[PDB]
Amino acid sequence: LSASEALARRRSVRAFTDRPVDRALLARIFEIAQRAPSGGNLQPWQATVVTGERWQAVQDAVAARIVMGREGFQPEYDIYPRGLTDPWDSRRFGVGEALYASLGIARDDKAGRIAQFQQNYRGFGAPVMLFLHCSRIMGPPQWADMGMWLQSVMLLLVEHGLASCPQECWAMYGATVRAELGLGDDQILFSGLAIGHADEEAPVNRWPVPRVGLDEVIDWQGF
Amino acid sequence: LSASEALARRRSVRAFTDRPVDRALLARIFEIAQRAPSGGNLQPWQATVVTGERWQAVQDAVAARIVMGREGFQPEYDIYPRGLTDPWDSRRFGVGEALYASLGIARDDKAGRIAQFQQNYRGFGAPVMLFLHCSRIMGPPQWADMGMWLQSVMLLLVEHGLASCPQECWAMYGATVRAELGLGDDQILFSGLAIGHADEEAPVNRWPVPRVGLDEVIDWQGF
Ligand SMILES: Cc1cc2nc3c(=O)[nH]c(=O)nc-3n(C[C@H](O)[C@H](O)[C@H](O)COP(=O)(O)O)c2cc1C
Ligand SMILES: Cc1cc2nc3c(=O)[nH]c(=O)nc-3n(C[C@H](O)[C@H](O)[C@H](O)COP(=O)(O)O)c2cc1C
């Protein structure tokens, strides 16, 4: 599988089969993903990978927070910018529209879409959850470094016939997640990464995901 | 070239040939790179790509700042964390020594380190410079998004027989660069990316670049 093909085939998978992930395979993928570049070769990314009973504990701990409602939230940071405007805000809901449409839940049906949302905290049934975190001394460019590493992993997973869904929803309960994992407060949780084998027949995995055109992204000067 | 191979063969290239870059190739690469994921599909990354006369104008404007010395600096942000410590600093010093050894530039050699500094602001002789920037409303997770896009770009270049060097050195003169590109102060410059055909005979492009072992990266729980 070529780099181009891996990139095309990578999507956020929100339906996984009940099927284990070979840990030896995982380690080899992390080995190669470490070749991601970073400012000053700092390699600021740290990861805690969980499965089985530990993965079950994290889910339980967060579930206990979820039923507290808005009172239970523990945001690591502002997931979205507070002053978010168009064109960006609309991009969120365009993808949202497609996702829920691909399922069998109406637009107005606020009850059912909530239910599917909570599936996030089961990692959409993935056997493995990766938690990506770093020291709180790190600034924005090191967060960009983390992104380079995370995309490397996601691409490598696809090349090896695995799949993933990156999840910032975990940062909504950062302290609970950090406490459950045994991470100290010197660390900040950025994102989770659900990892497993895709259910390739699941409709939620088959809808075409949109992107803006290059005219909204790239300016050419001097050509 | 497989995704694994692309990741392994990508390095920060600091010597380029005069061979021109097919814009048609670049544009197709960007089309694919847009498939990078982002939190909420915000796709926050923006890029202004420059070549030819406009590219030299940017160099000229920044060069005007360099001769001002420490007064010429216009930091967009802290490139390295204030209060950086080990293990990360040690990682930096490792690649630094390696890079300078390949150039034949000594510790005492203040002349060469300055020249090497100045070479950064020529994009190391690359025919095309990409400037990655975003709205100033974006937060750290959106900077991670930019990182996912940028690594996507760097891998695709390598797949197509091209090469790159990510460059935060441009952020040192952000306002000069943004002013020259015609960017407003609503935008913040993250990084440059030099793009072109690598000079593979160049020793600076040939030394083995270090990475820490997975024992410093991944914690396994529940296996
Ligand atoms: C950092 C990050 C966090 C994400 N978090 C979530 C999440 O918590 N829940 C979710 O359903 N999708 C999440 N996503 C997936 C995005 O919604 C998705 O990347 C975007 O819609 C593009 O679609 P695609 O990745 O399937 O191509 C996340 C993506 C990124 C990059
Ligand atoms: C965001 C970013 C900015 C960078 N800026 C520079 C730079 O200004 N000058 C430079 O020589 N290298 C720069 N680099 C290259 C790093 O030093 C390099 O990625 C790291 O040493 C690992 O080496 P490699 O990319 O060749 O594998 C940058 C890398 C990243 C990710």
Residue numbers in the entry:
A (entry chain A), B (entry chain B): 9 to 231
What is the paper's account of this structure, in its own sentences?
Recently, the nitroreductase NfnB from Sphingopyxis sp. strain HMH exhibited metabolic activity for dinitroaniline herbicides including butralin and pendimethalin, triggering the initial steps of their degradation and detoxification. The protruding middle region of Val75–Tyr129 represents a structural extension that is a common feature to members of the PnbA subgroup and functions as an opening wall connecting the coenzyme FMN-binding site to the surface, therefore serving as a substrate binding site.
We determined the crystal structure of NfnB in the presence of coenzyme FMN at a resolution of 2.1 Å. Two monomers in the asymmetric unit are related by noncrystallographic twofold symmetry, with a buried surface area of 7006 Å2, calculated using the PISA analysis. Coenzyme FMN is bound to the pocket in the dimeric interface, with an opening to the surface. Within the pocket, coenzyme FMN is oriented with its isoalloxazine ring packed against the β3 backbone atoms and exposed to solvent via the opening to the surface. Arg18, Ser20, Arg22, and Arg219 mediate interactions within 3.3 Å along the ribityl moiety as follows: Arg22 to O2 of the moiety, Ser20 to O3, and Arg18, Ser20, and Arg219 all to the phosphate group of the moiety. Except for a contribution by Met180 from η4, the opening wall consists mainly of side chains of residues in the protruding middle region, including Ile87, Tyr88, Arg100, Phe101, Val103, Leu107, Tyr108, and Phe125. Near the entrance, the opening has ∼16 Å of Cα atoms between Tyr88 and Phe125 and a similar distance between Glu176 and Val103. In the structure of NfnB, Tyr88 and Arg100 are neighboring residues at an entrance to the opening and show possible interaction between their side chains within ∼3.5 Å. Consistent with the findings of a previous study, butralin was the best substrate for the wildtype NfnB, followed by pendimethalin, showing 21-fold lower enzyme efficiency (kcat/Km) than butralin, whereas no activity was observed against oryzalin or isopropalin.
